[PDB]
C-alpha cells in the first residue's frame, strides 16, 4: 500500500524547508492521511503551510495569531481564547489566522483553478460572516473579501512569486499536470 | 513534606518555556517557597512572569527596563539607578517594569477574580503615586491607571488570549478550580 | 474523543527527552493511535524507545543498527539490506536492533509483570530462531536467550535503574497502578 | 596551470565573509572559471556579491528579491515567476535584484573606472527599459537611472565606505594596481 | 543582610564554569543558604561540585551514576532505584556517586585540613559499610577506603592539580586564609 | 609585577559581557597596558566600550559606523574610507563613531567628575570642528555639542542607568573610591 | 542543456547528508561535470563519497588521512606531505585514503557489477604497488588486496548495508536500472 | 611602523584555525610583539601552537595538561600546582605540556634546520633534567630524549604531514625562503 518513495515526495522534501514538511506530516497524519501515498495532497499541505507563514510574516510584530500548523485540539483552544477575549463570533470551521489589527479570522486558500471558483467554494462553506477569506492561485491572481487584502502589495507579491516558482519546479519534473488534476 | 511530583508541577513544566520556569524557581526559592509544594503559587509566578515579558515585548526597542525576573538585590540596584538618573520618586515596593517613554514604574498583576477588586487591592498598597498599575484577568479584562494602557490594543490582546489558553489547559486537567481558589 | 491534556501525557512530556516523545508520537500515529487518548500506551512506547537507545549505546561504535524509531517502511528497508548482505534469515516481525558483533537481530521488551511471562509471550510469536530476545522489567530483572545478555553488567544495570526511576515517578503522581494494569 | 595559492586568493579569503566566497566560487565555477587562477575576477565577484547583499539589506523587510547568488537556472526560475505575476517585461540578461516597491529589476555594477563609463557600458547592453541600473565605484561615486537611487543616503553611504576599505587593503598588499588594470 | 556582591562571590563566578555555579546555587538555596552571604560555603560547594564531575569523568562511559548535583528529592529517587535493582544496602546519607563497576556508593570529600582528619570525620557518620569514601585535600593528598582509589593515577592527579590551582588563586586575592578557617 | 588576580579584575569579568572584556584586553594590550595591573583603566575601557555599543544600538539599522573596538590600524582604514567618500574633514584623533544620518564623527567620553569639566577637556584636544562630542557621567548627566544629543531620550536614559548600576556594584565591593580617584 | 531538476537529483538530495552532496558538487564541478545533467554520475560521487567517510570512521582516532573530498590541488599537497615524511612511493593517481597504521595508500571503489571485474579494472590502472585497493558492491560483496580488509567485519558490514539500502531506494523510484547501466 | 596587512599575515589567517591565531596573537602581544610586523614569528607561534595541540590530542583522555596557550601567569600557576602535587622538580623555563602518564614536563620545538641542532640548543637551556624534549622539523624528522617518543607512530606521523603541508603552502606563495631564514 504505502511505498518506499515517490517522485512527488522527494520533490516536496527538496522544495520546502524541513519545518514545513515536518508540520504537514503531523497534520496529514492527524487526519488519517499518509504523505507517502497521498503525495499530491502532501504537496498541497506544504504549499498551504508555507503561504500561511509568509502571510503572518507580512504583518506587524504582534499582528497575527497563527491557527494553522497546530494540533487540531490546540488550534481550537486558541480560537476559544480569541473569541472569549475579543467577543468575536466563534467560527464553524478552523480558520488559518486571526488578525488582531482588524479583529477578524482569516481563511487562506491556494488553488490551481480560477481564484473566482475557489473563493465561491470557500465562501459557501464558512457562513461565519466575520471570517475573512484570502485566495491565492499558482498563476499570480489573488482574491479577498471586500477586496480588503489585509497586507500590502509587496508582501502579497512575493507569495505569488513563490507559488509560480513551485509551479515551474513541479513542471520541470513533469509533476504539475498530475498536481493540477488533483484539485 | 516535599514530594517527587504533582499534577500542577508537571503541567507548569509543559506549559511555560524553560526560561520562565527556571526564573520562577529561583524567584520562589529566593523567598522561602518550594515550587514542588506551593504548586499553585508556582503556576501564578510563571503566569505573572510570562505576562511581564510579553508586556515589555510590546514596546519599542529601548522602551522598558525589566525589573521582574531579577535577583531581589539586583532589582533594587536597577531601581536605584533609574531613580537617581531620572529623578523619579523611589517606590516603596519592587515594581515590575520601568517605562522610559512615559517615565514611570509599572506594576503588573494577574488575577482570577474581578480586575476591579485586584486593582483596588494593589492600589491601596503602593502609595507611590508615580507607579503605574496594569491589571489583567484570566477572563480577558484589563484595567490601568488613568485608563492609560501604555501599549496598543494588539499587544494587550495577545496577552489576554494567552491567559485564557492557560485557563482552558488548567481546566482540561481539572486543575483550574483549585487554582482559582488559591487567590 | 481526544482531549486537551491528561495527567499521563504531561508526565510523559516531563520525563523523557523531547527526541523520544517526538518519535513515539510519529510511531503511534503511524499505527492509528493517538498519544492524547492512549496515554498509557504513550508511556510504554517512550519507555520502550528509551530502552532501545540506551541498549545500542552500551555497545561499541559500529556494533548495532537501530531498527526501532524508524518509519515502518524504512525499517523494513534496513532489515532487507542487513539480510541481503549478511545472509541472515529475514525475520517475520520487525526487530528492534541488529547486532553486527554477534550477527543476530534483537527484540527488546519492557514488562510490568514477570520477565518469565513476557519472554515466553515474545518467544511464541517470533519463531525466527536467529532473533535474540532481551526482556527487562520495572523491578530490575532481565532475561535473555541462552542467557546471552549481549552487553556487560554496567550497561544493563543503568537501564534497570532508569526503569525503576520511571516506576517511582509514575507512582508519586498515582499513575502507576493504571499503567501496570494496562499490560 | 592551477596553483596551490596566490596572494590575491588569500586576501580574498581574509576580506569577505565565508558565505560570500563560497558563493563566488560556485558562481565562477558555474561559468568555467577557477578562482585559484582568475584571482582578480575572484575578488571582483566577491566585491560584486557583497554589494548586492548590502543593497537588499537597505530596503524594507520584503522589499527585494535577490537574483544574484543563485544557481543560474534557479535565477531564471525566479525571474520567470516575477515576470509572470507582476507582468513586468522579461529581461534579456540576468539582473541582480527585483524591487517589489518600485516594480523593476535592478542591475548592480562595481567599477574601478569612472561610473560615467561603466554605466554607459551597462546601459548599451540591457535594452530592457524597465531594468534599473545602479553603479558604484571604488572612489565613492554612484550613478543611477533617472537619478533614482532607490535606497536612502545612509544605506548607499556605507556601501561606498566598504568599497574604499577594500581598495585600501588591496593597496596595502600591493595588489590594487593589478586589480584596477583587470577591468 | 544579603549584599550586592563580595570578593569571594566574584572570584567564584570567574573560577568555576557557569554550569557548576548554577548548580551550587540551586543546591545551597535548597538548604536555606544564600551564596551571596555564605560566600565561603559557596566556594566549597562549587569546589566539591567540580571534583565530583571530574571523578565521574575518569571512569568508563557507563561506569558511574551521579547523585550529587540533583534536586534532593530526585537524588533519593535514583538511590532508591539503584538499591532496588542491585540489592545494595540503602545508605543513611545521600552519597555523591554510585560505581556500577564495583557496585558501591561513593562519598567524596574536599578538605582544607589533613585528609586523615576529614576521613575519620566522614567515616564516623556514614556507618553504611558498603559506601566507599574518597577524600581529597587542597595540598595534593588523597585517602580512600581499603586504599581502593577506584580511578587510576592520572585521573586522580589532575583533580589534585585543579585543587591546588584553586588554592593559589584564592591566595593571590588574599581570600585563602578566610577559606581555610571556615572548615 | 603582574599578579594572578585582583578584586577589580574579577569584578570586571563578572560585570561586562565576555565580548566587551575580550575587546578591552586586545585594545589595552595594543597600547602597552596590562589589564591585570592597570585594573582601574581596565574597568574604564570596558565601561567606555559598552557605552559606545549601546549608543550605536540606539540609532537606525545603518545609522552608525563603529570605530571603537577595532584594531588601531583598521580603525584608521575605516576613517579614511569615510572621509574619502563623504568628503568630511579627516580628524586628528581616532573618534568612536561616525553618524551617517548627520554626517559627523562622534567622540564619546565617560567621566567620574563633572561632565562640564571632561567636555572642556575633550573639546580642547579635538579641534576638528566637524567631530561631535557626547559626554556621560556616572551620576546621570550628559553633555553634547550644540546640545545636539543625536539619540532620543530613552536610548540615552538606559545608558545613564547602566552607568549608575556600575557605580553601585563598584561601591558594594568598596572599589568605587579608588576608581573615581583614578580619573 | 542543463534543466531545473531531475528525479535522480531530487533523490540524491534526500538520500545523502548535505555535507556529502555539497562536496560531490564541488568535486564534479572541479572536473567539468554538472550534477544537474550528469545525474547518475552525481549519485555515484555521493555514494563513493559516503563510503570513504564511513571507512575512515571505522579506524582509530588518528588512523587515516582523508584524501578524497579535497580540492584536487590540496589533495596532491597532502599526498606530497605523506610521501615526503613516510618515504612511501608517490602514487601515479590520487588515492582516497592513507593508512598510518599500515603505511599504505588506499583506493576505494564502488561497483554495480562483480567486485571481481572492477578490482581487476582498478588494479591494471594503479601500478603503484604500495597502494591498497578495497572494492565494494551494491550486492554486499567486498574485495581487498592480499585479502587484507584493513577494517574489522562490523565496520565493513554497515557499509554493505548502506549500499544495499541505496540500491533499494533507487529501485523503489524506478531509478536503479538506469544507474546500473551507467557503470 | 605597523602596516595594514602582509602576505604572510594573510596566509597565516587562511592556514590555521581561528582559535590558533587568536591565541598566538594574545601570546605574542603578551611579550611585546606585533603579529602585523613580526609576520614570520607570527607563523612560527601558530605552527608551534598547532603542534602542541595535536600532541596532547594523541594521548589518552586525561593524559596531558596543556601549559602552552595560557596566559603566562596562569601557566606558572598550573606548573606550581603540578609540582606541588606530584613532587616533580619545578622547571626553570615554562614547558609546553605535562605528561601525567610518565610524570614529566615536555618541551616541544619546531625547527627549519636539522633536528640535531635545535635539540642541542634546547637541551643546553633547560637543565631541569626531568623535562622531556621532543623536536619536530619541517622535513619529517623527529628527536626525543632517551628516544622516548611518548606518543605512538601514527600520532607523530600526522604531525609531520601537517608540517610539510605548511612548508609547501608557504613555498607556493614564495614565503618559505624568508621563513626558513628567520630561524
Ligand atoms: C516559533 C513557532 C511559531 C510559528 C512558526 C513560524 C514559521 C517560520 C519559521 C521561522 C524560524 N523563520 C523565519 C525566517 C525563515 C524561517 O524559517 N517560517 C517558516 C517559513 C517562513 C517563516 O517565516 N514562525 C513565524 C514567527 C517566527 C516563527 O518561527 N508557528 C508554527 C505553527 C504554529 C506557530 O505558531 N512555533 C511556536 C511553537 C511551535 C512552533 O513551531
Ligand atoms: C536577555 C534577558 C533579558 C530578559 C529576558 C526576556 C525573555 C524573553 C526571551 C527571549 C529570548 N524570547 C523572545 C522570543 C521568545 C523568547 O524566548 N521572552 C521569554 C518569553 C517571551 C519573551 O519575550 N527577553 C526580552 C528581551 C529579549 C529577552 O531575552 N530578562 C529576563 C529577566 C531579566 C531580564 O532582563 N536576560 C538579561 C540577563 C538575564 C536574562 O535572562
Ligand atoms: C542520529 C540519530 C540516530 C539514532 C538516535 C539515537 C538517540 C540518542 C540521541 C543522542 C543525541 N544522545 C546521546 C546522549 C543523549 C542523547 O540525546 N539518544 C537519546 C536517548 C539516549 C541516546 O543515546 N542516537 C544513538 C547514536 C547517536 C544518536 O543520535 N536514531 C533514532 C531512531 C533511528 C536512529 O538511528 N538519527 C539518525 C537519523 C534519524 C535520527 O534521529
Ligand atoms: C538566507 C539566504 C538569503 C540570501 C543571503 C543573504 C546574505 C546575508 C547573510 C546574513 C546571515 N547576514 C546578515 C548580517 C550579516 C550576515 O551574514 N548577508 C551576507 C553579507 C551581508 C548580509 O546581509 N541574506 C540577506 C537576508 C538574510 C540573508 O541571509 N541569499 C544568498 C543568495 C541567494 C539569497 O537569497 N539564502 C536563501 C537560500 C540560500 C541562502 O543563502
Ligand atoms: C548532562 C548532565 C549530566 C551531568 C553533568 C556533567 C557535567 C559536565 C558537563 C559537560 C558538558 N562537560 C564535559 C567537558 C566540560 C563540560 O562542561 N562537566 C562539567 C565540569 C566538568 C564536566 O565533566 N556531565 C558529565 C557527563 C556529561 C555531562 O554533562 N549532571 C549534572 C548533575 C546531574 C548530572 O547527572 N545533566 C543531566 C540532566 C541535568 C544535567 O545537567
Ligand atoms: C558584529 C560585530 C559588530 C560590533 C559588535 C557590536 C556589539 C554588540 C554585540 C551584539 C551581538 N549584541 C546585541 C545584543 C547584546 C549583544 O551582545 N553588543 C554588545 C554589547 C551590547 C551590544 O549591542 N554589535 C552591534 C551590532 C551587532 C553587534 O554585534 N563591533 C565590535 C567592534 C567593532 C564592531 O563593529 N563585529 C564586526 C566584526 C568584529 C565584531 O565583533
Ligand atoms: C572536519 C572535516 C573532516 C572530513 C569530514 C568527515 C565527514 C563526517 C562528518 C562528521 C561531522 N560526521 C560524523 C557523524 C556523522 C557526520 O556527519 N561524516 C559525514 C558522513 C559520515 C561521517 O563520518 N569527517 C570525519 C571525521 C570528522 C569529520 O568531520 N573531511 C571532509 C573531506 C576532507 C576531510 O578531511 N573537514 C576538514 C576540513 C574540511 C572538512 O569538511
Ligand atoms: C577547551 C580548551 C582546551 C585547550 C584547547 C585545545 C584546542 C583544540 C580545540 C578543539 C575544539 N578541537 C578538537 C578538534 C579540532 C578542534 O578545534 N584543538 C585545536 C587544534 C586541534 C585541536 O585539538 N583542546 C584540546 C582538548 C579540547 C580542546 O578544546 N586549550 C587551549 C590552550 C589552553 C588549553 O587548555 N580551553 C580551556 C580553556 C581555554 C581553552 O581554549
Ligand atoms: O483547514 C484546513 N485544514 C485543516 C487541517 C488539515 C490539514 C491537512 N489535511 C487535512 C486537514 C485547510 N485545508 C486545505 C486543503 C487544500 C485544498 C483543500 N484542503 C483540505 O484538506 O480541506 N485548504 C485550506 O485552505 C484550509 O484552510
Ligand atoms: O512583586 C512581586 N513579587 C516579588 C518577588 C516574588 C516572586 C514570587 N514569589 C514571591 C516574591 C509580585 N508577586 C505577585 C504574586 C501573584 C499574586 C500575589 N503574589 C505575591 O507573591 O505577592 N503578583 C504581582 O503582581 C507582583 O508584582
Ligand atoms: O550578472 C553578472 N554575472 C552573472 C553570473 C556570473 C558571475 C561571475 N562570473 C561569471 C558569471 C555580473 N557580472 C559582473 C562582473 C564584474 C564586472 C563584469 N563581470 C562579468 O562577469 O560580466 N558585474 C555585474 O554587474 C553583473 O551583474
Ligand atoms: O580613543 C580612545 N582610546 C583609543 C584606543 C585605546 C583604548 C584603551 N586604552 C588606550 C587606547 C579613548 N580612551 C578613553 C580613556 C577613558 C578616559 C581617558 N582614556 C584614554 O585612554 O585616553 N576615553 C575616550 O573617550 C576615548 O575615545
Ligand atoms: O579518484 C576518483 N575521483 C577523483 C576526483 C573526481 C571526482 C568526481 N568526478 C571526477 C573526478 C574516483 N572516481 C570514481 C568514479 C566512480 C566510478 C569511476 N569514477 C571516476 O570518475 O573515475 N571511483 C573511484 O573509486 C575513485 O577513486
Ligand atoms: Mn486551515
Ligand atoms: Mn486555509
Ligand atoms: Mn513583581
Ligand atoms: Mn506584579
Ligand atoms: Mn520494535
Ligand atoms: Mn521491542
Ligand atoms: Mn548579476
Ligand atoms: Mn551586476
Ligand atoms: Mn554530596
Ligand atoms: Mn561529598
Ligand atoms: Mn575611542
Ligand atoms: Mn571615546
Ligand atoms: Mn578518489
Ligand atoms: Mn576511489
Ligand atoms: Mn612553550
Ligand atoms: Mn615549545
TrEMBL record, chains A, B, C, D, E, F, G, H:
- Which residues are listed for Mg(2+) 3 binding in this entry? 68
Q: Which residues bind Mg(2+) 1?
A: 14
Which residues are involved in binding Mg(2+) 2? 48, 96, 107-108
Residues reported to bind Mn(2+) 4:
96, 107
Residues binding Mn(2+) 2 = 62
Which residues does the annotation say bind Mn(2+) 1? Answer: 48, 96, 107-108
Q: Where does Mn(2+) 3 bind?
A: 68, 96
Amino-acid positions noted as binding Mg(2+) 4 in the UniProt annotation, renumbered to this chain? 68, 96, 107
Q: What is this protein called?
A: Polymerase acidic protein
Instruction: Supply the gene name.
Output: PA
Part of the intact protein present: 1 to 195 of 409
Amino acid at each position: 500500500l504505502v511505498p518506499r518513495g515517490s517522485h512527488m515526495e522527494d520533490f516536496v522534501r527538496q522544495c520546502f524547508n524541513p519545518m514545513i514538511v515536518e508540520l504537514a506530516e503531523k497534520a496529514m497524519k492527524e487526519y488519517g492521511e499518509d504523505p507517502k501515498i497521498e503525495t499530491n495532497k502532501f504537496a498541497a499541505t506544504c504549499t498551504h503551510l508555507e503561504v500561511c507563514f509568509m502571510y503572518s510574516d507580512g504583518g506587524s510584530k504582534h499582528r497575527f495569531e497563527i491557527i494553522e500548523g497546530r494540533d487540531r485540539i490546540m488550534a481550537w483552544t486558541v480560537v476559544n481564547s480569541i473569541c472569549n477575549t475579543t467577543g468575536v463570533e466563534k467560527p464553524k470551521f478552523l480558520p488559518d489566522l486571526y488578525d488582531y489589527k482588524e479583529n477578524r479570522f482569516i481563511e487562506i486558500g491556494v488553488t490551481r483553478r480560477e481564484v473566482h471558483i475557489y473563493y465561491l467554494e470557500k465562501a459557501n462553506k464558512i457562513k461565519s460572516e466575520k471570517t475573512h477569506i484570502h485566495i491565492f492561485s499558482f498563476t499570480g491572481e489573488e482574491m479577498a473579501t471586500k477586496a480588503d487584502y489585509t497586507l500590502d502589495e509587496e508582501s502579497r507579491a512575493r507569495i505569488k512569486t513563490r507559488l509560480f516558482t513551485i509551479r515551474q519546479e513541479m513542471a520541470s519534473r513533469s509533476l504539475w499536470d498530475s498536481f493540477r488534476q488533483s484539485e
